[PDB]
Amino acid sequence: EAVVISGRKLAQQIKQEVRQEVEEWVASGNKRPHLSVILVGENPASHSYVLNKTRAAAVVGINSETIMKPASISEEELLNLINKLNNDDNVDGLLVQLPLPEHIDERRICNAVSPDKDVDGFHVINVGRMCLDQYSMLPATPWGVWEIIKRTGIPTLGKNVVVAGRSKNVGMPIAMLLHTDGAHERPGGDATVTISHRYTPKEQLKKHTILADIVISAAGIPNLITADMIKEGAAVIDVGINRVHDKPKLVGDVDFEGVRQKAGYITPVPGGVGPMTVAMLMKNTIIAAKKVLR
Amino acid sequence: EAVVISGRKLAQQIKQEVRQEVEEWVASGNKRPHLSVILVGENPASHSYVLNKTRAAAVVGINSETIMKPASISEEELLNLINKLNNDDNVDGLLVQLPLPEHIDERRICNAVSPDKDVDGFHVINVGRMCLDQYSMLPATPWGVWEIIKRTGIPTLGKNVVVAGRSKNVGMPIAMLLHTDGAHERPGGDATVTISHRYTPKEQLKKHTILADIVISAAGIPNLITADMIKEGAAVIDVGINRVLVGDVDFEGVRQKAGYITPVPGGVGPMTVAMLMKNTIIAAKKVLR
Numbered sequence: 342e343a344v345v346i347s348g349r350k351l352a353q354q355i356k357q358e359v360r361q362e363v364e365e366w367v368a369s370g371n372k373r374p375h376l377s378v379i380l381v382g383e384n385p386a387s388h389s390y391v392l393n394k395t396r397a398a399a400v401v402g403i404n405s406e407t408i409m410k411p412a413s414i415s416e417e418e419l420l421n422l423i424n425k426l427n428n429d430d431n432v433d434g435l436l437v438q439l440p441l442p443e444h445i446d447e448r449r450i451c452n453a454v455s456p457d458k459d460v461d462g463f464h465v466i467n468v469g470r471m472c473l474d475q476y477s478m479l480p481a482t483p484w485g486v487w488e489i490i491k492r493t494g495i496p497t498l499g500k501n502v503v504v505a506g507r508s509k510n511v512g513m514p515i516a517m518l519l520h521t522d523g524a525h526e527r528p529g530g531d532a533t534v535t536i537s538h539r540y541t542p543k544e545q546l547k548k549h550t551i552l553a554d555i556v557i558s559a560a561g562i563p564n565l566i567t568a569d570m571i572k573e574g575a576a577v578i579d580v581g582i583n584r585v586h587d588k589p590k591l592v593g594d595v596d597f598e599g600v601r602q603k604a605g606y607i608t609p610v611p612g613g614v615g616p617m618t619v620a621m622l623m624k625n626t627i628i629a630a631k632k633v634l635r
Numbered sequence: 636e637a638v639v640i641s642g643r644k645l646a647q648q649i650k651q652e653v654r655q656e657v658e659e660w661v662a663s664g665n666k667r668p669h670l671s672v673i674l675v676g677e678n679p680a681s682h683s684y685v686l687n688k689t690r691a692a693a694v695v696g697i698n699s700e701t702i703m704k705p706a707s708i709s710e711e712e713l714l715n716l717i718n719k720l721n722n723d724d725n726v727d728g729l730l731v732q733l734p735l736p737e738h739i740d741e742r743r744i745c746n747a748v749s750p751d752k753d754v755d756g757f758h759v760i761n762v763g764r765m766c767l768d769q770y771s772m773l774p775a776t777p778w779g780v781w782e783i784i785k786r787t788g789i790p791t792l793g794k795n796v797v798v799a800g801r802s803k804n805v806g807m808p809i810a811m812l813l814h815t816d817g818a819h820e821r822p823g824g825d826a827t828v829t830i831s832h833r834y835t836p837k838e839q840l841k842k843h844t845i846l847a848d849i850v851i852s853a854a855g856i857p858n859l860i861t862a863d864m865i866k867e868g869a870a871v872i873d874v875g876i877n878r879v880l881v882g883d884v885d886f887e888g889v890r891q892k893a894g895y896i897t898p899v900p901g902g903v904g905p906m907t908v909a910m911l912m913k914n915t916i917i918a919a920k921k922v923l924r
């Protein structure tokens with residue numbers, strides 16, 4: 342059957358690296374790295390997610406704090422907090438949990454965060470830089486995905502890859518990473534990439550997946566990817582994080598049970614990509630702390 | 636056989652639209668738009684392209700000066716020159732012709748042009764905005780390809796598109812425009828897009844192209860696309876400009892299988908220049924920032 346890849350395990354490794362790198366940075370007598378998180382309102386998943394990131398920083402020896410605010414808050418307000426933090430030399434990374442309330446403009450918030458602290462890599466300059474294959478604060482989930490692939494020894498160069506979904510902070514950067522030149526400042530995957538989305542016809546999607554050596558799903562649609570869609574031996578990465586009921590639980594976009602018996606590798610949900618996301622956040626924070634980039 | 640779309644005719648159309656918009660704009664009492672072009676060294680094609688640009692400016696009533704310089708220029712000189720132009724409130728759009736000499740950092744330059752006068756759309760902020768589907772100054776060849784498609788009337792939503800090439804200023808932006816959400820600030824094609832490049836083996840190219848409702852070729856390789864690669868009836872867009880000058884496609888042959896096709900010369904090339912005029916008037920109007 343399919344090698345199942347543990348994102349839980351892989352992420353724990355990665356955090357171990359980070360722990361050490363931070364240990365080193367402090368023992369050379371640099372300041373201990375500080376991550377600030379802003380959380381607005383009360384989405385319960387959102388809470389869970391900050392909790393995750395607060396733990397991770399604890400584990401790897403990074404100082405954390407979560408500044409909570411009521412959904413009641415205004416855009417101008419939020420910008421002032423963000424402005425406080427950009428100037429607090431104690432804060433190395435600054436991250437704004439999403440989504441924000443509809444009366445706050447996400448893009449403007451994202452570009453408020455100083456790019457040098459932008460551990461989410463959602464600032465316009467980081468996006469620009471990533472799209473031009475330059476060094477940048479890479480976004481965590483796409484970077485996670487790439488780490489899964491690169492650490493499992495799965496090749497990409499020359500290979501056919503489909504990414505379903507095209508969100509600006511997951512699908513598009515994944516596709517950007519995977520298709521680009523291995524030779525540029527920020528190496529990419531040199532794969533041949535297909536972007537699918539909410540207006541791909543299921544038959545046309547399937548027609549592309551069937552040719553795919555790697556299928557990467559970030560649609561947020563259960564049972565989107567079924568074993569009849571997948572070539573034999575293929576690697577299947579599940580970025581989906583879908584909340585259904587059967588008691589209330591969580592699934593990917595892959596038919597795990599089906600696909601597992603056709604695929605050469607697969608990631609579980611839970612315990613695949615989610616934790617890899619939190620791991621790369623820790624990577625970006627140490628990087629931010631070392632003032633490496635701009 | 637296959638309808639040959641006239642790049643020349645469409646570029647005429649767009650140029651006419653810009654001429655009118657410029658006249659109204661001047662007639663309302665605004666400054667007549669000015670575009671400066673920096674030329675460096677003495678590349679034959681560079682010189683020809685710069686002239687193609689200033690020609691189109693005059694045709695649509697935009698003022699232009701093509702400032703031509705020696706390869707031997709220092710990079711810091713150039714940055715100082717650009718800062719002049721960035722600062723001259725008389726310049727609305729400034730574009731640096733490429734390629735520059737191996738001794739100068741394109742990226743440092745491209746990023747030195749004011750985003751607000753960056754008619755080529757190659758400033759990192761313009762690339763960023765574009766990749767986030769925000770309003771932005773679109774790069775001209777990508778926007779040209781798109782206009783050719785929207786104008787000819789070829790649907791894109793749901794459809795299957797393939798793009799050969801991933802250059803940061805042609806192929807990648809094309810692939811960006813075509814796959815993204817029609818609903819966004821800067822709408823996109825809502826197509827299903829495949830990006831191929833130099834590590835795509837012909838086997839794989841063909842395996843994708845044949846399912847392609849629209850194939851867009853921007854690889855810079857004679858004859859790359861042959862009619863067995865194409866699905867009969869499909870739209871084929873030849874963004875190639877290669878000095879043997881012909882395209883990336885096989886014209887005569889492909890022409891019989893394809894539903895639509897674009898020549899070379901007389902295809903995308905002239906459109907690229909048209910869209911630059913569109914961008915210069917947008918610049919002059921200071922809509923964006």
Ligand SMILES: O=C(c1ccc2c(c1)CS(=O)(=O)N2)N1CCc2[nH]c(-c3ccccc3)nc(=O)c2C1
Nearest residue numbers: 390393439440582591610611612613615616618619
């Ligand atoms: O913190 C986690 C996390 C950790 C572990 C884990 C999961 C998620 C799902 S799991 O596979 O059960 N295990 N994440 C990954 C998913 C995730 N997704 C979003 C989010 C919000 C809106 C839109 C798209 C993504 N914001 C976030 O901040 C996070 C953080």
Ligand SMILES: O=C(c1ccc2c(c1)CS(=O)(=O)N2)N1CCc2[nH]c(-c3ccccc3)nc(=O)c2C1
Nearest residue numbers: 683684687733734876899900901902904905907908
């Ligand atoms: O100036 C033209 C142009 C206009 C019309 C036209 C052709 C070319 C070939 S044609 O079909 O004979 N008609 N272009 C389009 C191609 C083009 N290509 C490059 C360029 C820059 C660096 C490297 C390679 C090409 N720089 C440019 O600035 C332009 C502007």
